[PDB]
């Protein structure tokens, strides 16, 4: 048992009736002094270290060559000038076991935290030494955290793709299904999560070439995708992860959900494929009135109307489909389907729930397409256009496949530094650079959509940590007030940066003219409503920072109308799973799951108290399972009104909650504007 592990395990040894939280600083100090300083490869100077790293195929020389060595040395000195110290053992452990560069034999540490931050900043700046120093200050202050792919792989020759979220539209044809399998394997090989929309595939029992009862439905394609994701396991260290989304009005919806039942037969079970369901307002209306609903065979609709079922407005087309004899449909119980969804989410946490009308009533790019499905983390909500993959020697009709590179603001550190605007703009610039440097060679629609849309995802983390470290209950009205003001400011400054980038580069995203940004319909609520804090306590937290007013939003609206917007999508709140430890921040905007996180690494167990946890703020670090999920829904809906994409929203349920409680939580989320529901976690 190592000394640092012994010190960390002393956290739970209560002394004087209170946890010994100070043992974590001792634990991290001992961890460093006894493992990291010993196992760190020694270089005489930065020049020798950089030459060794570049020569040994560690660092790409393309990005480093853009700077004179004096500039690189200055950036590295800027990174080390802060004297950054990890405040807890878990943060340093996570960094030096997951992200710190290690020799090919994985026995020595080539990168410190400062070295990794400096390399990422140099990669971001793209030759701008002052920009690189600004990035170094942003990341060393831990105001902005690049996503795990960008942070880990940036500047590395062996690096994989800096983007990790991929959404693919699958067309209803064998050629398209084969291409989807190939692209899913190609993207998983790169380590990115791949989400597929199966709503266009015809249901089981549909005809292929005037041959009836030939189609196998979406479950056969799901088995193919599950096998493909299992094969492309990314060395096996992280098993291949894929998500399949199906509209609730698809015929195969019941079979689609049955793949996640434990009682399901093994020939139907899909082990490695997450499933999400897209629920239009029509289904909720049908269940509310207890009316009998119908699930439609997609190919009959496509033949009758020449357009896909999921390409149409179900709230306008459901009655026409029901009344159309040429459309094939079978009756279902919408309330029975909702209860089945709740039961499945309780048993396995699946499927993800996407409220299509909640997403598309605020979607700015409905002209390009409506948001038909989400990603593997349930927070990516963008317009997609399906591709037409034809026969060999036939030209393909490449559509738009969704992808975004992620970054997270550290709310606590952004508020402590009073640098919301600067942090947001620098994060937007870094995300734009990552997007511009991405080129996927086996996903034509992904690459085309990356070039055309320039979609980025700027999330946030440490909301609960910041609130608890400030004497604010997560469920309290003041917490929602702060979230409203902060995320309104984030949206304002991200829109301003996008417009400024469009002005500087002279280009907007493809089909920007038809977006709600161009027509000004996006800014209606911001020019009509004031989002300043309504509580004095919350308003004081923003002291020293300028909170945009309706006049500021009017000016920004005029500026956007003049110059346009560079990004079709800017904000999405991803889970931010493992990089939160490095930042010593709570995960995303969700409430903390546990006050002290007990985990076993190797054969020694480690304890991770929530950042800033102490006796004074112990009660404010309320666990999610003890929280009223209605208040969590209220907070997420408050945040979501300023996020153009979705928010990964996990439901934390007690074992005593029935399926009716889960159904009520989902119905309240739909009522409150929640776009997606990620997971049903039960204590």
């Amino acid at each position: 048992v190592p000394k640092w592990i012994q010190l960390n395990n002393e956290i739970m040894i209560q002394k004087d009736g209170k946890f010994q939280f100070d043992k974590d600083k001792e634990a991290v100090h001992s961890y460093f002094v006894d493992y990291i300083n010993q196992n760190t490869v020694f270089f005489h100077n930065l020049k020798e270290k950089l030459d060794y790293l570049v020569e040994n195929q560690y660092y790409e020389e393309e990005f480093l060559s853009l700077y004179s060595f004096e500039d690189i040395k200055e950036v590295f000195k800027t990174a080390y000038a802060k004297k950054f110290r990890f405040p807890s053992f878990m943060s340093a452990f996570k960094f030096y076991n997951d992200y710190a560069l290690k020799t090919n034999d994985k026995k020595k540490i080539l990168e410190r935290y400062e070295d990794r931050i400096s390399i990422v900043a140099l990669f971001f700046a793209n030759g701008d030494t002052e920009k690189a120093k600004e990035y170094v200050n942003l990341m060393i202050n831990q105001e902005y955290q690049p996503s795990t792919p960008t942070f880990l792989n940036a500047g590395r020759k062996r690096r994989g793709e800096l983007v990790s979220c991929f959404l693919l539209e699958v067309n209803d044809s064998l050629n398209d299904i084969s291409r989807a399998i190939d692209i899913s394997m190609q993207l998983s090989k790169l380590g990115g999560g791949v989400s597929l929309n199966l709503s266009k595939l015809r249901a089981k029992g549909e005809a292929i070439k005037d041959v009836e009862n030939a189609t196998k439905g979406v479950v056969g394609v799901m088995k193919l995708l599950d096998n493909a994701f299992r094969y492309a396991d990314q060395m096996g260290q992280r098993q291949g992860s894929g998500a399949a989304y199906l509209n609730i009005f698809h015929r195969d919806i019941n079979d689609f959900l049955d793949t996640k039942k434990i009682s399901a037969d093994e020939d139907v079970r899909v082990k490695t494929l997450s499933i999400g369901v897209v629920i239009p307002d029509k289904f909720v209306e049908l269940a509310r009135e207890d009316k009998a609903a119908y699930v439609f065979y997609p190919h009959t609709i496509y033949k009758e109307y020449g357009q896909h079922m999921d390409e149409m407005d179900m709230n306008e087309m459901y009655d026409k489909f029901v009344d159309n004899p040429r459309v094939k449909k079978e009756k279902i119980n919408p309330r029975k389907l909702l209860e089945k969804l709740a039961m499945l989410r309780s048993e396995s946490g699946y499927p993800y729930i996407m409220f299509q009308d909640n997403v598309n009533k605020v979607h700015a790019n409905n002209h390009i397409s409506k948001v038909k499905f989400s990603n593997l983390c349930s927070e990516v909500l963008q317009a997609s256009q399906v591709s037409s993959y034809t026969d060999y020697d036939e030209e393909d009709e490449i559509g738009l496949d969704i992808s975004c590179n992620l970054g997270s603001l550290n709310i606590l550190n952004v508020m402590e530094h009073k640098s919301i605007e600067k942090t947001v703009k620098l994060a937007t610039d870094s995300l734009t650079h990552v997007s511009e440097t991405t080129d996927i060679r086996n996903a034509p629609a992904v690459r085309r959509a990356n070039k055309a849309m320039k979609s980025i995802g700027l999330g946030a983390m440490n909301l609960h940590g910041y609130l608890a470290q400030n004497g604010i209950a997560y469920e309290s009205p003041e917490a929602r007030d702060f979230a409203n003001t902060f995320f309104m400011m984030v949206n304002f400054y991200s829109i301003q940066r996008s417009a400024e980038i469009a002005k500087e580069k002279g280009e907007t995203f493809d089909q920007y003219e038809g977006s709600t940004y161009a027509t000004g319909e996006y800014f209606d609520k911001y020019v009509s409503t004031d989002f300043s804090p309504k509580y004095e306590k919350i308003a004081n937290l923003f002291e020293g920072m300028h909170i945009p007013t309706t006049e500021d939003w009017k000016k920004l609206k005029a500026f956007v109308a003049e110059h346009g917007m560079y990004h079709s999508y800017r904000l999405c709140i991803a889970p931010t799973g493992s990089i939160s430890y490095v930042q010593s921040s709570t995960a995303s905007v969700m409430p903390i799951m546990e006050r002290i996180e007990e985990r076993t690494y190797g054969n020694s167990k480690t304890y991770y108290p929530m950042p800033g946890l102490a006796s004074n703020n112990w009660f404010f670090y309320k666990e999610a399972y003890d929280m009223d999920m209605f208040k969590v829904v209220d907070m997420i809906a408050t945040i979501q009104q300023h996020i153009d994409q979705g928010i990964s929203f996990t439901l934390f349920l007690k074992d005593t909650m029935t399926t009716r409680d889960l159904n009520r939580i989902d119905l309240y989320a739909h009522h409150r504007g929640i776009k997606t529901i990620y997971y049903a976690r039960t204590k």
Binding site: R288, D290, R335, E339, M343, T658, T659, R660, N663
Partner: peptide, 12 residues
């Protein structure tokens, strides 16, 4: 456990 959704469960 499993319990059915009543009409009032759709209003808030």
């Amino acid at each position: 456990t499993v319990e059915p959704l009543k009409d009032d469960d759709f209003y808030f």
